[PDB]
């Protein structure tokens, strides 16, 4: 390969029988080694084995001499060879894994079927109902252990998830829509397909994901083409759901504090190895992240913030070495930091360790729960339509061109691979300017090569939202 089964029903009754069942994969081993046959000096006969004991000497018949007690020294250069993975999976998420605990199965791959399956997947398979030990203070009488084999996996590829692992009409859709000079501020009602606010700040997302340019030089540098954002304010503004709903909108994760981080220099079960998992500059090298609670997180993993945002000057020393990995990462930031707009407009006391956090980023526009009585009742009843009735799946689908997740993500992931765009001849200090990334951005926002200073000082006029926070 028809029709499935479950796991809570299968025992001696159905042993050595081939079955269809389904779960969700967890993790498993690499591929090591196997063979079937070779031969030995002692007899020089092929190592004919049925299954995938240990023997008479036969280095004997030299007249009388015997040599019993097994001098069988394998000569593996004579050998054959097969594969393995040794796999594992967990049973279903719907068949009481809650009041019970989840049981599972151990597996055996053979030749061609590894490098095929990574966990986070849902499969249908056939196997074999076999065990591994022999019998009758373990095993008070005779207890034994479960496993199965591999035979005839058939996986699920469920529909619209998988531009993850596995047209020119759509390019017409890309470009002949792109010809419209109505995308920069048009989509200020787009990234919140269910929310109001952030409108002219969605104006500044339009440059964000498209990126700037890593215009390296004949001398050393690889300077910060990447760009980041900061936002700040109290709860109630739905800034959680702003990042939660943004997860689906290129590659990202949304958790904050005490619950990845750094490396995994620990061991596994298999002949006690030590092999790593990397960081998440690993998982973000063109992908970017949206992450709250800088302040409400452990102070350990904060040397790797300046060691990535400023330079990408990353290094390790756990074992005696500097795995010096790097990545093209950037971040959106959120917070519920100390005392809102009463703090923001006035001077600089938010974080009690560094003023550094205003330097490396530019667009910091405040989150408030401003009282505006004309809208306070609206936001008092902007929350009963949300609270009720489960209707709003694709209400934004009818919009001219502020929807279609797939086409938009692909819009971008072509766009961020066009050329080396630039601009034209054309407290406003050095890191306001070093905005120039947004200048070059509008080349790729209009999908052009070039652009000018002050048509594209749209960004300047939007940054004036932020600078009023910390001008004074």
């Amino acid at each position: 390969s028809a029709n499935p089964t479950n796991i809570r029903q299968l025992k001696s009754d159905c042993v050595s029988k081939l079955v269809k069942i389904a779960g969700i994969i967890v993790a498993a081993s690499g591929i090591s080694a196997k063979a079937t046959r070779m031969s030995i000096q002692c007899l020089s006969c092929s190592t004919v084995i049925p299954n995938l004991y240990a023997l008479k000497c036969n280095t004997e018949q030299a007249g009388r001499p015997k040599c019993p007690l097994d001098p069988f020294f394998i000569m593996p250069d004579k050998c054959k060879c097969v594969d393995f993975q040794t796999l594992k999976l967990q049973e279903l998420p719907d068949f009481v894994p809650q009041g019970e605990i989840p049981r599972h199965l151990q597996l055996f791959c053979d030749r061609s079927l590894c490098e095929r399956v990574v966990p986070g997947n849902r499969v249908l398979i056939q196997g074999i109902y076999s065990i591994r030990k022999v019998g009758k203070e373990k095993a008070v009488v005779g207890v034994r252990a479960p496993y199965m084999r591999v035979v005839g996996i058939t996986v699920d590829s469920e529909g619209a998830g998988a531009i993850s692992r596995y047209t020119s009409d759509e390019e017409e859709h890309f470009r002949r829509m792109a010809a419209s000079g109505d995308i920069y501020e048009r989509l200020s009602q787009s990234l919140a397909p269910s929310i109001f606010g952030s409108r002219d700040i969605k104006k500044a997302i339009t440059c964000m994901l498209f990126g700037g340019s890593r215009k390296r030089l004949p001398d050393g540098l690889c300077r910060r083409g990447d760009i980041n954002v900061l936002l700040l304010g109290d709860p109630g503004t739905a800034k959680s759901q702003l990042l939660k709903f943004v997860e689906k909108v290129p590659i990202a994760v949304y958790t904050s504090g005490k619950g990845s981080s750094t490396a995994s220099v620990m061991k596994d079960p298999q002949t006690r190895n030590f092999v790593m998992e990397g960081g998440a500059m690993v998982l973000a090298d063109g992908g970017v992240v949206c992450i709250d609670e800088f302040d409400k997180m452990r102070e350990d993993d904060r040397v790797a913030i300046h060691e990535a945002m400023e330079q990408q000057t990353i290094s390790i020393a756990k074992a005696g070495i500097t795995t010096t990995l790097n990545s093209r990462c950037s971040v959106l930031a959120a917070a519920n930091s100390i005392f809102g707009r009463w703090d923001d407009t006035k001077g600089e006391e938010n974080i009690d360790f560094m003023p550094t956090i205003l330097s490396r980023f530019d667009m910091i526009f405040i989150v408030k729960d401003i009282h505006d009585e004309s809208r306070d009742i609206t936001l008092a009843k902007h929350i009963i339509n949300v609270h009720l009735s489960s209707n709003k799946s694709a209400p934004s689908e009818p919009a001219e061109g502020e929807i279609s997740l797939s086409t938009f993500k692909k819009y971008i992931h072509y766009c961020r691979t066009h050329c080396g765009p630039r601009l034209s001849e054309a407290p406003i200090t050095v890191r306001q300017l070093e905005v120039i990334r947004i200048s070059e951005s509008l080349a790729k926002i209009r999908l052009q090569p070039f652009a000018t200073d002050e048509h594209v000082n749209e960004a300047l006029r939007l940054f004036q939202v932020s600078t009023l926070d910390a001008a004074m």
Binding site: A33, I74, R272, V282, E307, S315, E425, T429, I436
Partner: protein, 600 residues
Amino acid sequence: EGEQFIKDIQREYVDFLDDEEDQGIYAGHVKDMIAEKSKRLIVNVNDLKRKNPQRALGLLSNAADEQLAFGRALKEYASTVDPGYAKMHEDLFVGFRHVTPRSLTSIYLGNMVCVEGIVTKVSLIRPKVVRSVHYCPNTRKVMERKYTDLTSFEAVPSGAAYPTKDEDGNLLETEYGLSVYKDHQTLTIQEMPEKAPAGQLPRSVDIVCDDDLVDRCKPGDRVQIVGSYRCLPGKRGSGTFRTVLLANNISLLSKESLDISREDIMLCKKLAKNNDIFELLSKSLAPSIGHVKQAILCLLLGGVEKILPNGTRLRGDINVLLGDPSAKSQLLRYVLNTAPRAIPTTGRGSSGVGLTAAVTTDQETGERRLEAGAMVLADRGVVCIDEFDKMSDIDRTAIHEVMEQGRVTISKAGIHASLNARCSVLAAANPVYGRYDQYKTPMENIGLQDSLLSRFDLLFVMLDVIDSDVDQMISDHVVRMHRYRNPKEYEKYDALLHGKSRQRHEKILSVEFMRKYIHIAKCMKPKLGEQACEAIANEYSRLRSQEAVETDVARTQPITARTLETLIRLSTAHARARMSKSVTIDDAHAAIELVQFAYF
């Protein structure tokens, strides 16, 4: 003697050893009379494909047994030519498709193929022994029994303890100095991780090495390494299967070698008379940068060493950093990338400056971690870090130690050790009130400690104002940056003019031409003449007398004579920027303007 094809294999290999390839290129007085004894006469498979392609495959299809025969051919030849390179009748291996460590699928067994990856878990040395050289003090006959293992051949002896009482029960005893032995090594390989897939956990590999192949590098480096396969043990008659790949030669790739014969020294000698190359040489660390760098010259050049006869020596190095925020975290990079193995570090971290404290609370093996220092790799190297204003006061002590001595001396139960280091290091900055530098006070607008006057080696200035006259100047240079950044001044071509009104050329303005005068530059010893002492003494007198007055006394904290070491050993680094076997009044002039830029 197997099947007699082995002999024609030997002869087909030896048919390489006759004519202009052999007579002109290959061995003899190309290795042997240069007196090296490093057996390995380097092979390239493509010749084997060219002469005997079937024998270009005899390797790749059965690598169990081409090998004693290769050795036979070699020892026969060299014995035929040189009985001097002839008294070491051993195996004598030689040099000789790259898939991943993720891409070994049951096969390549028997094949001598390439895989790439990282060094990790470089381990201990062991001998391994070849024969047993027995002698019978009754009958007094030096007899022998070779040993073997699969790791060289298929053949293995009754590999066991020394034999005895087997011949007769006679007077039977070993001897040493005769039963030779083999250098054995073990480690494992990881892929280069930048490729790595996010969904899976990458595989390692395991390898074995041998005699002349012992570890010219370290766990956590990357080199191309080629190997055959075997697999010795059983599989469940016993216990399941596990393998390794082996039979190797060596490379190393991520270095510089350097098409450098004695011509390149001729080049460094060619531009020598050009006097103020200092100019370009200082414009060789700021093309994308005002300001300084002529001062960073010496920290690039390390320092100088000088010793008393029948006495001891001096630590030699230079370390400086200073201002206002927003070029500091994108300036240091210039020296992470260019000058050999100069390693920045975290700025706020430990488990890697110098500290061990036997931290094995996981696996708990034999070794008790006696090495977690990344500042002794700065031995004769260079370092920079951030967080100095945020630095722990744990190490300010330790740096007081270093700057005075430059050696570590720890005895926390691992061992009472001490280890050379000849290092330098840089820093960060954060004054807790910003734009206060002198009007309020010169010193301690900064959030700092003042034990460290003489322990760094210059006081300088770094300041800022967005302006009125420099407003449009900032505008136009930022733009000239932004388009001299850019081509014609792909995705981005070459930008020249305003490096053309500047009459240089990037093959006189270049990296290899830059370090043209490093590697011999860092090997000179240009002693002093007859002139420094006088003026330096008068002017250090004037320094120590009148630099502490007239509205700059508060910016005149570091006066010591420990500067006078620095005041002169900088002109040393300068004196090894031109190979002049002296130092001069002109070097005097050029080695005071430090003083002027500090405030003047």
